[PDB]
Amino acid sequence: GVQVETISPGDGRTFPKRGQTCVVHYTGMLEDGKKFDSSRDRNKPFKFMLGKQEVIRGWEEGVAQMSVGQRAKLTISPDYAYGATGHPGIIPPHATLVFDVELLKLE
Numbered sequence: 001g002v003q004v005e006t007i008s009p010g011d012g013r014t015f016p017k018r019g020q021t022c023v024v025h026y027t028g029m030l031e032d033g034k035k036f037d038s039s040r041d042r043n044k045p046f047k048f049m050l051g052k053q054e055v056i057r058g059w060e061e062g063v064a065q066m067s068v069g070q071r072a073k074l075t076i077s078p079d080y081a082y083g084a085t086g087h088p089g090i091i092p093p094h095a096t097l098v099f100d101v102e103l104l105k106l107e
Protein backbone atom coordinates (compact mmCIF):
# COMPACT_ATOMS: atom_id res chain seq x y z
CA GLY A 1 0.00 0.00 0.00
CA VAL A 2 1.24 3.43 1.06
CA GLN A 3 3.23 4.25 4.20
CA VAL A 4 3.07 7.86 5.37
CA GLU A 5 5.92 9.24 7.50
CA THR A 6 5.68 12.86 8.64
CA ILE A 7 8.63 15.15 7.83
CA SER A 8 6.87 18.21 9.30
CA PRO A 9 3.39 18.21 10.89
CA GLY A 10 0.45 20.14 9.44
CA ASP A 11 -2.21 21.93 11.50
CA GLY A 12 -3.71 18.51 12.30
CA ARG A 13 -7.24 19.81 11.65
CA THR A 14 -7.64 20.85 7.99
CA PHE A 15 -7.83 17.77 5.77
CA PRO A 16 -8.85 17.65 2.07
CA LYS A 17 -12.43 16.83 1.11
CA ARG A 18 -13.37 14.63 -1.85
CA GLY A 19 -13.58 16.81 -4.97
CA GLN A 20 -11.33 19.49 -3.46
CA THR A 21 -8.19 20.67 -5.26
CA CYS A 22 -4.98 19.91 -3.37
CA VAL A 23 -2.00 22.18 -3.99
CA VAL A 24 1.29 20.39 -3.34
CA HIS A 25 5.04 20.51 -3.82
CA TYR A 26 6.70 17.14 -4.41
CA THR A 27 9.88 15.28 -5.25
CA GLY A 28 9.60 11.75 -6.64
CA MET A 29 12.22 9.01 -6.73
CA LEU A 30 12.52 5.27 -7.23
CA GLU A 31 13.09 3.63 -3.83
CA ASP A 32 16.85 3.78 -3.12
CA GLY A 33 17.15 4.95 -6.74
CA LYS A 34 17.03 7.91 -9.11
CA LYS A 35 14.96 11.07 -8.70
CA PHE A 36 12.62 11.32 -11.70
CA ASP A 37 10.46 14.36 -10.91
CA SER A 38 10.31 17.50 -8.76
CA SER A 39 7.66 20.25 -8.88
CA ARG A 40 10.00 22.37 -6.74
CA ASP A 41 12.53 22.46 -9.60
CA ARG A 42 9.99 24.11 -11.92
CA ASN A 43 8.96 26.58 -9.18
CA LYS A 44 5.24 25.88 -9.60
CA PRO A 45 3.11 23.77 -7.22
CA PHE A 46 1.31 20.65 -8.47
CA LYS A 47 -2.49 20.53 -8.33
CA PHE A 48 -4.94 17.62 -8.40
CA MET A 49 -8.55 17.00 -7.39
CA LEU A 50 -9.00 14.38 -4.65
CA GLY A 51 -11.36 11.46 -5.33
CA LYS A 52 -11.29 11.85 -9.12
CA GLN A 53 -8.77 9.06 -9.85
CA GLU A 54 -6.44 11.74 -11.24
CA VAL A 55 -3.37 10.34 -9.46
CA ILE A 56 -1.98 6.95 -8.37
CA ARG A 57 -3.63 5.17 -5.42
CA GLY A 58 -0.69 5.84 -3.07
CA TRP A 59 -1.14 9.58 -3.63
CA GLU A 60 -4.94 9.41 -3.34
CA GLU A 61 -4.79 7.65 0.03
CA GLY A 62 -1.58 9.36 1.18
CA VAL A 63 -2.64 12.98 0.63
CA ALA A 64 -6.15 12.26 1.97
CA GLN A 65 -4.65 11.63 5.44
CA MET A 66 -2.52 14.79 5.41
CA SER A 67 -3.52 18.14 6.93
CA VAL A 68 -2.71 21.60 5.51
CA GLY A 69 0.95 22.48 6.04
CA GLN A 70 2.00 18.85 6.46
CA ARG A 71 5.07 17.47 4.73
CA ALA A 72 5.44 13.69 4.52
CA LYS A 73 7.48 10.86 3.02
CA LEU A 74 5.16 8.57 1.06
CA THR A 75 6.53 5.10 0.35
CA ILE A 76 4.27 3.63 -2.32
CA SER A 77 4.39 -0.07 -3.19
CA PRO A 78 4.01 -1.06 -6.90
CA ASP A 79 0.33 -2.07 -6.52
CA TYR A 80 -0.50 1.48 -5.34
CA ALA A 81 1.65 3.06 -8.05
CA TYR A 82 2.24 1.75 -11.61
CA GLY A 83 2.18 -2.01 -10.88
CA ALA A 84 3.44 -4.67 -13.28
CA THR A 85 3.05 -2.36 -16.30
CA GLY A 86 5.11 0.57 -14.98
CA HIS A 87 4.86 4.03 -16.51
CA PRO A 88 6.12 3.99 -20.13
CA GLY A 89 9.70 5.27 -20.44
CA ILE A 90 10.01 6.50 -16.83
CA ILE A 91 8.95 3.91 -14.23
CA PRO A 92 9.85 0.21 -14.69
CA PRO A 93 7.64 -2.79 -13.74
CA HIS A 94 7.31 -3.47 -9.99
CA ALA A 95 8.80 -0.15 -8.87
CA THR A 96 8.38 1.08 -5.30
CA LEU A 97 8.18 4.88 -5.32
CA VAL A 98 9.19 7.44 -2.70
CA PHE A 99 7.55 10.87 -2.75
CA ASP A 100 8.31 13.88 -0.58
CA VAL A 101 4.94 15.65 -0.56
CA GLU A 102 4.05 18.96 1.12
CA LEU A 103 0.37 19.93 1.27
CA LEU A 104 0.47 23.70 0.75
CA LYS A 105 -3.23 24.65 0.52
CA LEU A 106 -6.73 23.56 -0.50
CA GLU A 107 -8.79 25.24 -3.24
Ligand SMILES: CO[C@H]1C[C@@H]2CC[C@@H](C)[C@@](O)(O2)C(=O)C(=O)N2CCCC[C@H]2C(=O)O[C@H]([C@H](C)C[C@@H]2CC[C@@H](O)[C@H](OC)C2)CC(=O)[C@H](C)/C=C(\C)[C@@H](O)[C@@H](OC)C(=O)[C@H](C)C[C@H](C)/C=C/C=C/C=C/1C
Nearest residue numbers: 026028036037038046048053054055056057059087090091
Ligand atom coordinates in the same frame (compact mmCIF):
# COMPACT_ATOMS: atom_id res chain seq x y z
C1 LIG B 1 4.67 16.21 -17.37
O1 LIG B 1 4.37 15.81 -16.04
C2 LIG B 1 3.19 15.00 -15.96
C3 LIG B 1 3.22 14.14 -14.69
C4 LIG B 1 4.41 13.19 -14.57
C5 LIG B 1 4.18 11.93 -15.42
C6 LIG B 1 5.20 10.85 -15.10
C7 LIG B 1 5.27 10.57 -13.60
C8 LIG B 1 6.33 9.51 -13.30
C9 LIG B 1 5.47 11.86 -12.79
O2 LIG B 1 6.80 12.36 -13.01
O3 LIG B 1 4.51 12.85 -13.18
C10 LIG B 1 5.25 11.66 -11.30
O4 LIG B 1 6.02 12.17 -10.50
C11 LIG B 1 4.12 10.87 -10.80
O5 LIG B 1 4.23 9.66 -10.68
N1 LIG B 1 2.99 11.53 -10.47
C12 LIG B 1 2.74 12.96 -10.67
C13 LIG B 1 2.47 13.59 -9.30
C14 LIG B 1 1.22 12.95 -8.72
C15 LIG B 1 1.42 11.44 -8.58
C16 LIG B 1 1.87 10.76 -9.87
C17 LIG B 1 0.71 10.53 -10.81
O6 LIG B 1 -0.30 9.94 -10.44
O7 LIG B 1 0.82 11.01 -12.18
C18 LIG B 1 -0.27 10.75 -13.06
C19 LIG B 1 -0.05 9.41 -13.78
C20 LIG B 1 1.21 9.42 -14.65
C21 LIG B 1 -1.24 8.95 -14.64
C22 LIG B 1 -2.58 8.79 -13.91
C23 LIG B 1 -2.50 7.77 -12.77
C24 LIG B 1 -3.88 7.59 -12.12
C25 LIG B 1 -4.90 7.09 -13.15
O8 LIG B 1 -6.18 6.93 -12.53
C26 LIG B 1 -5.00 8.05 -14.34
O9 LIG B 1 -5.85 7.47 -15.33
C27 LIG B 1 -6.53 8.45 -16.11
C28 LIG B 1 -3.62 8.34 -14.94
C29 LIG B 1 -0.36 11.94 -14.02
C30 LIG B 1 -1.02 13.14 -13.37
O10 LIG B 1 -0.84 13.40 -12.19
C31 LIG B 1 -1.91 14.01 -14.22
C32 LIG B 1 -2.08 15.39 -13.60
C33 LIG B 1 -3.25 13.32 -14.35
C34 LIG B 1 -3.66 12.67 -15.46
C35 LIG B 1 -2.79 12.56 -16.69
C36 LIG B 1 -5.02 12.01 -15.48
O11 LIG B 1 -5.55 11.93 -14.15
C37 LIG B 1 -6.03 12.71 -16.40
O12 LIG B 1 -7.15 11.84 -16.52
C38 LIG B 1 -7.82 11.95 -17.78
C39 LIG B 1 -6.49 14.05 -15.87
O13 LIG B 1 -7.55 14.11 -15.27
C40 LIG B 1 -5.68 15.31 -16.10
C41 LIG B 1 -5.85 16.28 -14.93
C42 LIG B 1 -6.07 15.95 -17.43
C43 LIG B 1 -4.97 16.82 -18.04
C44 LIG B 1 -5.37 17.30 -19.44
C45 LIG B 1 -3.66 16.07 -18.09
C46 LIG B 1 -2.56 16.63 -17.60
C47 LIG B 1 -1.30 15.90 -17.62
C48 LIG B 1 -0.36 16.21 -16.73
C49 LIG B 1 0.91 15.48 -16.70
C50 LIG B 1 1.94 15.84 -15.92
C51 LIG B 1 1.87 17.05 -15.02
